[PDB]
Ligand binder design. Sequence first.
Ligand SMILES: *C(=O)C[C@@H]1O[C@@H](C)[C@@H](O)[C@@H](O)[C@@H]1O
Ligand SMILES: [Ca+2]
Ligand SMILES: [Ca+2]
Length: 114
Amino acid sequence: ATQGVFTLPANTRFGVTAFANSSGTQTVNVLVNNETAATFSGQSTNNAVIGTQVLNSGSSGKVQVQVSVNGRPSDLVSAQVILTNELNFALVGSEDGTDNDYNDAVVVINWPLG
Ligand SMILES: *C(=O)C[C@@H]1O[C@@H](C)[C@@H](O)[C@@H](O)[C@@H]1O
Ligand SMILES: [Ca+2]
Ligand SMILES: [Ca+2]
């Protein structure tokens, strides 16, 4: 199944934050309406924040997270969770290798802000 694609409410600010847990440099791309809106890159085996930013979901609300290592796409897992019908988390894990810890880049999208 497709992973890392989330439909947000239109024209809504959201946070996106990426953590790294791999010996390989992670590249995280965030697309809004199929167009790159932010790109994070970094290397850490200790959960370092490699990027954090506030974006707007735009007219379509379509947000997509892509993760790759030197252009090779990682295998993604994702889900969205809503607490008290108000607080939203869009969660992405990714695997760049064979150990299947799925933490090599971890991406958290959260909304609403403010
Ligand atoms: C490369 O060595 C594999 C890679 O980096 C490890 C340190 C560990 O984070 C593993 O999960 C990751 O896929
Ligand atoms: Ca891994
Ligand atoms: Ca890892």
